[PDB]
Write a protein that binds this ligand. Structure first.
Ligand SMILES: CC(C)C[C@@H](N)C(=O)N1CCC[C@H]1C(=O)NCc1ccc(C(=N)N)cc1
Ligand code: NA
Ligand code: NA
Lengths: 251, 10, 28
């Protein structure tokens, strides 16, 4: 996260760290959506241009974390993957369209002050909240700059950007399964997601029921926090049918 | 690398 | 689920975090 701040304890208790077993390192962010399902970006798990193709046994999920590098005894929980599900129409060849994946945990994780699931939007919440200028929040342990790495989880709040501005900011083909967020050069303030923040959640707090909903997944960008560029997010609500289908078919 | 080792159990 | 999106250390205790209000204020 670029130009963010340290998170408060328990501020994002749905934050998941995807962790490579050997060599032991951060791979991506992710989110807890129930006691056995974690949501992330497909590209975290599969990206052939970079010879990335992870299997369940390559990985661990670490939940309840604050500190990036530290083992957070008595607080974080570490879970094994039972199964990975990548969107069957994830477009890794071109623009990361449908950049979404589910991970099923071997055993249910125990909720705590630091571990709690985020909500997934229903149609009405998404219609009401996914509007240009409305702010969401992104969190992660990714790079602090586009060139270091943070000691603890970082947070930044960012305004959704109008689709023609998103489109005119890049040469990549943008789809209805994406949205972009960030400040305009004129707006002064700044901030963005960056490498390492991938797969983490873009959340909004519903003013109707004061619950947090995950509207986006950190997906892609060109550089980090560049003037005139915006971060792109997987549009969770648009891909919801596939999400429920997977959880319904594989419980 | 900069990461603290996790319990071998995981 | 039933209690998704309500954080134990904030909503469940009626405590606000330091910048959630910035989000509220943009929901115009
Ligand atoms: C081919 C895609 C559409 C663009 C590429 N730069 C990209 O962003 N990729 C290529 C493969 C994986 C993904 C990535 O790096 N995601 C990490 C990332 C980068 C930038 C941001 C940002 N908001 N600035 C967020 C995540
Ligand atoms: Na364009
Ligand atoms: Na920018």
């Amino acid at each position: 996260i670029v130009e963010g701040s340290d998170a408060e304890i328990g501020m994002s208790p749905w934050q998941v760290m995807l962790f490579r077993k050997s060599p032991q390192e951060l791979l991506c962010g992710a989110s807890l959506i129930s006691d056995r399902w974690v949501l992330t970006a497909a590209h975290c798990l599969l990206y052939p241009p970079w010879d990335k193709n992870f299997t369940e046994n390559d990985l661990l999920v670490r939940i309840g974390k604050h500190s990036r590098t530290r083992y957070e005894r008595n607080i974080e929980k570490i879970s094994m993957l039972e199964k990975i599900y990548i969107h069957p129409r994830y477009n890794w060849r071109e623009n990361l369209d449908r950049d979404i994946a589910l991970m099923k945990l071997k055993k249910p994780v125990a909720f705590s002050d630091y571990i709690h699931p985020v909500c997934l939007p229903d149609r009405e919440t998404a219609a009401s909240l996914l509007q240009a200028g409305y702010k969401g929040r992104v969190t992660g342990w990714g790079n602090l700059k586009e060139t270091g790495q943070p000691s603890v989880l970082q947070v930044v709040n960012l305004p959704i950007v109008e689709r023609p501005v998103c489109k005119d900011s890049t040469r990549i083909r943008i789809t209805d399964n994406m949205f972009c967020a960030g400040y305009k050069p004129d707006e002064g303030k700044r901030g963005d997601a960056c490498e390492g923040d991938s797969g983490g959640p873009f959340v909004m707090k519903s003013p109707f029921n004061n619950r947090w909903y995950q509207m986006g997944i950190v997906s892609w960008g060109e550089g980090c926090d560049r003037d005139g560029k915006y971060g792109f997010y997987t549009h969770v609500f648009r891909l919801k049918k596939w999400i429920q289908k997977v959880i319904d078919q594989f419980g | 690398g900069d990461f603290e080792e996790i319990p071998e159990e995981y | 689920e039933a209690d998704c999106g309500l954080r134990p250390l904030f909503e469940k205790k009626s405590l606000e975090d330091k910048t959630e209000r910035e989000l509220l204020e943009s929901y115009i």
